[PDB]
Design a protein around this ligand. Sequence first.
Ligand SMILES: Nc1ncnc2c1ncn2[C@@H]1O[C@H](COP(=O)(O)OP(=O)(O)OP(=O)(O)O)[C@@H](O)[C@H]1O
Ligand SMILES: Nc1ncnc2c1ncn2[C@@H]1O[C@H](COP(=O)(O)OP(=O)(O)OP(=O)(O)O)[C@@H](O)[C@H]1O
Ligand SMILES: OC[C@H]1O[C@H](O[C@H]2O[C@H](CO)[C@@H](O)[C@H](O)[C@H]2O)[C@H](O)[C@@H](O)[C@@H]1O
Ligand SMILES: [Mg+2]
Ligand SMILES: [Mg+2]
Lengths: 257, 437, 277, 363, 362
Amino acid sequence: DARRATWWSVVNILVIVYALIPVLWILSLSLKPTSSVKDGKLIPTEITFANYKAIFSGDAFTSALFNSIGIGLITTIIAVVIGGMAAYAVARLQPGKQLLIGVALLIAMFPHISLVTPIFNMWRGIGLFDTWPGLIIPYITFALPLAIYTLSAFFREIPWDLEKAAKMDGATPAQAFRKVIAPLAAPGIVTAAILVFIFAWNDLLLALSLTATQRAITAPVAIANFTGSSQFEEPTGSIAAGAMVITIPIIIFVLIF
Amino acid sequence: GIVINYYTPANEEATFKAVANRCNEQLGGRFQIAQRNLPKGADDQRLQLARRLTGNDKSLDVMALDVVWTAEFAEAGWAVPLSEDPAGLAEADATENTLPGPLETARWQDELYAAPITTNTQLLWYRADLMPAPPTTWDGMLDEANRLYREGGPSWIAVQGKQYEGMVVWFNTLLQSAGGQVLSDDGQRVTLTDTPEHRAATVKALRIIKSVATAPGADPSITQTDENTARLALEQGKAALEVNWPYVLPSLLENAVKGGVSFLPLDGDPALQGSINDVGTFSPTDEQFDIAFDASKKVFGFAPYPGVNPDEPARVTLGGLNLAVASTSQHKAEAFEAIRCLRNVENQRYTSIEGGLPAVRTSLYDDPAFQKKYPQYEIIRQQLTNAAVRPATPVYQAVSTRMSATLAPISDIDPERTADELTEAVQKAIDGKGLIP
Amino acid sequence: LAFWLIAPAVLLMLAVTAYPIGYAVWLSLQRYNLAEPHDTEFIGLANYVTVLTDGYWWTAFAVTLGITVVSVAIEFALGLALALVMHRTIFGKGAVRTAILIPYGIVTVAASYSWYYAWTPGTGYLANLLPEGSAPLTDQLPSLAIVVLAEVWKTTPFMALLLLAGLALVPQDLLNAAQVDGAGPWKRLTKVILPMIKPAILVALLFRTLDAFRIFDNIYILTGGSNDTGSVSILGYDNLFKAFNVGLGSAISVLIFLSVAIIAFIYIKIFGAAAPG
Amino acid sequence: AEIVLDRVTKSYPDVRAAVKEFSMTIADGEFIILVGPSGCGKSTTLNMIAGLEEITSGELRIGGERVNEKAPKDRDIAMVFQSYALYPHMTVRQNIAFPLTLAKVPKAEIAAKVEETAKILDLSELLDRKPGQLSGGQRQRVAMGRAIVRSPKAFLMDQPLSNLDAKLRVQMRAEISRLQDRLGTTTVYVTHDQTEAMTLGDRVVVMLAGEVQQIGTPDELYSSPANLFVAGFIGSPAMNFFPATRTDVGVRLPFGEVTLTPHMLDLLDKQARPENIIVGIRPEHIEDSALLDGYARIRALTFSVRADIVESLGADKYVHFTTFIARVSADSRVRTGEQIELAIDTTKLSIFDAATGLNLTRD
Amino acid sequence: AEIVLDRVTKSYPDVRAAVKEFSMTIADGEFIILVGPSGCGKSTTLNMIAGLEEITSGELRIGGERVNEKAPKDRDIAMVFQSYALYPHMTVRQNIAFPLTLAKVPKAEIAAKVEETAKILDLSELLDRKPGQLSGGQRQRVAMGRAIVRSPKAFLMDQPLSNLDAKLRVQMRAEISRLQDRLGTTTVYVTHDQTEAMTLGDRVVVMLAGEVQQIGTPDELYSSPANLFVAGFIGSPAMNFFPATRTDVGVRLPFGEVTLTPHMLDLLDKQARPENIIVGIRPEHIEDSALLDGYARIRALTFSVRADIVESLGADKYVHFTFIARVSADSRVRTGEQIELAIDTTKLSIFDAATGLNLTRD
Ligand SMILES: Nc1ncnc2c1ncn2[C@@H]1O[C@H](COP(=O)(O)OP(=O)(O)OP(=O)(O)O)[C@@H](O)[C@H]1O
Ligand SMILES: Nc1ncnc2c1ncn2[C@@H]1O[C@H](COP(=O)(O)OP(=O)(O)OP(=O)(O)O)[C@@H](O)[C@H]1O
Ligand SMILES: OC[C@H]1O[C@H](O[C@H]2O[C@H](CO)[C@@H](O)[C@H](O)[C@H]2O)[C@H](O)[C@@H](O)[C@@H]1O
Ligand SMILES: [Mg+2]
Ligand SMILES: [Mg+2]
């Protein structure tokens, strides 16, 4: 069946290279010596590792990963465990009113510049400025609306007959969920946790407005305010190496899944 | 223990980290200076400091704030008056050996709020193999660039062209060198057109900028050129004329002994090997220093800033860094001791010779070996006698943001229309009208 | 059950919206400057009548409108394509799904730097393809175009994964019946697949349209505020941390919060499909 | 448990009713078959009894107490759905054993009863394959099996055997009665295929338009139909019907006249005879009048007709006629286009009011 | 179009054949019922002909060409699935119309054919409800609606009338049989209801375990089954079977001897005589031996057994013995009573106890 299989393989390769090309462009810029970072050529030649060791001769990036993965995978769970209870309630019963959906939608927006404004004033008197007990609070408030609106708007649509059959065989609702809903909602719900981790680990705008010290300097802001360690040399290879080390937890996780 | 966090510009860290280490060996472990970074471009340094101050950051100890912000940070009470000094020594050490001009920028309404640590007037730089002597005037630069463009060489005139404080230092330098000024001496009144002579200066300055922005074979990236873009372009050999501050040298000789410079390869020379130490400090034996420097004079050179009018010495604008103790800090007396420590004369010497930043203590102009080791010293101190100042008001960063927004993108400037824009926009900034762009 | 089950979540949410957003509208009613911490006074609608009137606000608004509507239209259209080939895969078993995650998984700052260097003249692999003197980062409409392209590449898996989840429920019999009544791929896709998936597309496209409206990083790194352009998310940030006007910067926050809340209302009211029905 | 229903009623937007003041009773251990037209309200009555749907008005009593608002868990019913829904991921064993897992039974005993269910149901090999591999009647078998493992107070079933071949149907039908009797539990069956109803049904309920029409035994429903609709609705082919008029010894017909038995005349003397009578006869009572003996003749009427069409299913010729099928025995020599004479024992007739449809010969 | 199948085969992971090397020929405008047990190869075959499934081996020809690779649009057949799956996103008023919309039919022409179809299938009205409002006996008819709109190369109906009341079924069985005849279009159909199959079929194709068993007009399947399974599987109740031995004029039963007609005595000598033989008869051919006429009294064997159980069904009883006799309802027998039974020698059928084939097949 070559008429399908050749086309299908070409498209399967096309999406593979399209998902890689900018990541490979980062790796090539990272590995080119300072003589050839300016060469305008994608394929690297006469490779070096100088930029990586010039980052690792500094605690800044590791301490940024060390704290960022922490806040990211604390919030990706400790928000979602409350998000799931309210999402189940809003799917099963009527707190699922239009006003709860509208409020969750508005907060889903709560564009973070509009939230960091009032917050920054609060933390002039309240303090808690550089420690995690400042950053996580607006993070988790960004991580209940997603992990609520999407979470219910997906698993509430599971077929009624299977829910009737579970009720008729006499299951208690909160245990009927784990035995009959969760095992078949999972391929449509694994994405909710991934999208929240990809947000709670992966925003600059909060930390860029609400951190300064080494305390809680998260990996995105620790690149966005960074520029190459050699003040008298071209910064691009070091920024590229920085971007490269920043990708590592995500690409390792995607290769695990 | 006790730590004084010292904030300085990113691009001023290879000097400041190594001197903070020197000072920590001198203090005897009572307390330590720890160096920290603000952003590269000047306007982003103010942004990041104003956050740390406003958010009551307890870690912030001593600031290298830019020479132009002293009025704002004194008026807001964020930087201490020097009369806060727990030992009573600060106003004396601020006064005793500095210059009249550098020490005057630290005052707002008479009282000092800071102690100078660096000062800088910009210079013209040129490829000495591509032209015999640098032109004394902008029209001469346009001529040499237009000639080099016809001749097919690196004809870019590299200049600060991004919408940032840099772009405004240039405009103030042309206007003050043409004898005009942006604001009155009381800071109350806009002066680009209170009289036709100031307008004539203004439109001439704008027409110069427009001409160099539009000339055949000009840099297509000029509207995005930082000072770092300008320096690199010259280091990449793409520009034959460059207008920057007293820097370059550190990156030049460094990049040359790294072999990154096409016209000055020094990496291939066995006498210059090992010059760059493990932390990246240019540190040759002085015979190798002289070999590398003579090899530089053989191809590359520097000169006093170009005139607007023929036979007029240029009124170059001041730059610099002023230290102050931050109002939020716990370790006030230790921080005042640290400012007096970092301002010592051997660390000033070190700063200029190992880094490029011109020190502000005067006694080094009386040192012949310093006068050899920092070749540009004579023309810096000469230009400083003639220097223009940014217009001192607490309001200033609003004026810089509104004024620069009238000019970018540089190529579109009608001198009459944009003089009108400046007279409106600067008035609007003084009045505090509208959103800042 | 359900009025016990919302309690531990709403307990937090209600506080972290109510204090900040209420305090925002209070601050916007006042003259207030970060340099003069308690030395300025109540001012009514002064911040509104200024921020709604100046030219800069309407450009920074109109640009986020253009960028959101253009970037979502493309992100949607390519989102279906990535979803379909991830769902009906054959030769790309496992790998076809695995390669689709990383443009979501990368940090947006790193992506934006990569695009910035990709397009920078004389030092960018696709920049080298332009005729000489082009330098696209320096000009308004080209700078919009490259940030659209950067935003679109970064966002597409947001669409494609949600739309695949929305498609994966569709029972195969409905597609067999369409195929045996002879609806070719586009006929079924439009008469069966989209009408089945309606609610999940309007959810996905809503949260994208909001995200694409409040996006900041992808224009902050790629020439932030550079030669007009910019975005209302930048304009508000600047008027707060580099002009110290709390009165005006909060008024920008309120005026965008209302002007996005009507968009969140329109896809609930006009198109109907959302979480409750 | 007992079950009783008190004018239970259901209605929907258009509003229009779907069940209308229905009342009924089921003794503990009874076995009731619901039977009626397509679309008439069957599934909804069963769903409201099961608690999977909400009654509009009236009362439902289970155990003898009222249960209207009580949830499906509270009612202890096992149900098999009108479209037999299934859990698409669960392997067959678990798809069966699931209610035993809700009961938290010891796993060895769940697995044992999972084997007993598969054996009694003839789930052919307890196959443990995805439900997507057994489309057709294999799916319907698995869908029924979950119910018969539970053995609760009541079974509620909705055309449980529909997609089965005949050898499976009759085997399953016996398996249901064995299970029902061995447990002694109430069964409320539902079908519009009728021989399954008549052989199972210790009590058949006929319903039309959301309303009950007759409640009774297989014999009462066959032999004392309450009206011409139920008379025509029970059996196959439907009751042959004719207009008729009363004589002082019996009745006129489109081909002759019948001397009616004195017992039926006494019933026809209850109130009065209508201006037209619909007489009705089962097609399978009609036979070739050449075949009768004297004991049938004395109570026969005969007429000849041309055979409009003919078929045979073996046992019987289905021969068409018009003023109909005569479902005559295959012993008749008839072919289409021949004259043939049709007769029956008039003791077997039915008669009905041409206005209101009620049976006049009601025993 | 004609349809022809040669060696067509399907297999699945276990690989196990769902069907093994089926073959038949169907002329343009025939009518075929693919009757068979739950596991016998049916829906699977129907999905192969529709092209919704890979043919594992063999060849399919339609309309003068081989079509194994052509996609389901290309084949221009129509079907009603066993699941009768409707779209739940369109009122019935277009869910029936849907193929006419793909065919670019004019709006009023579509509406006319749709309301004519709606009257034809006795739909409640052109009900214009969402399918979630219907049940079974409405939903299944609506699914059949979109097939009977199309007039395709062929129809493939998978259990189409399985879910309807008997008074409506026979009306729909009239409507289908008129439609196939008026259209002149090849039709294939599947059901478990053999009584609905017999009245429709020009030809029946009884199938077991993925294998075709016998093909013909019902007459053959009822009167001349090829093996014991077909003989047991067709009819109701199932065929009675007894162990037997040959005589040179007849056969011995557990309760007597029956003289055979010379044709069977010739055929049973023309084939090799087996060491064990089984005799089969329909329950409806067994009757009260008191009720006979002279030729049956001459030709039959009579024996008596106890009616251990009894049931009634109008014209017939069932009575139980050790088996069922479907005796005529003129029999006055009660439960627990001895009764004499008889049958005609010509209606007995004879089967090999080893290979299972019918030696009384003609
Ligand atoms: N979900 C529903 N919403 C609205 N009305 C409904 C619904 N289900 C059934 N009805 C109404 O009830 C009637 C059919 O009821 P019901 O489902 O009991 O029929 P049924 O006899 O079970 O069907 P079948 O012929 O398959 O046995 C229809 O006339 C319809 O109008
Ligand atoms: N997708 C599949 N994967 C694996 N096995 C399958 C699949 N589809 C069918 N089978 C197997 O092949 C056989 C095919 O069943 P077939 O279609 O012949 O029965 P049917 O026509 O559905 O009978 P009925 O309609 O009377 O239930 C089934 O018994 C099933 O176990
Ligand atoms: O001289 C080196 C300094 O360069 C930057 O400062 C520049 O910023 C403005 C011009 O763009 C002026 O205030 C100043 O004169 C310029 O030099 C940099 O911010 C400084 O850290 C450097 O010391
Ligand atoms: Mg029903
Ligand atoms: Mg089937």
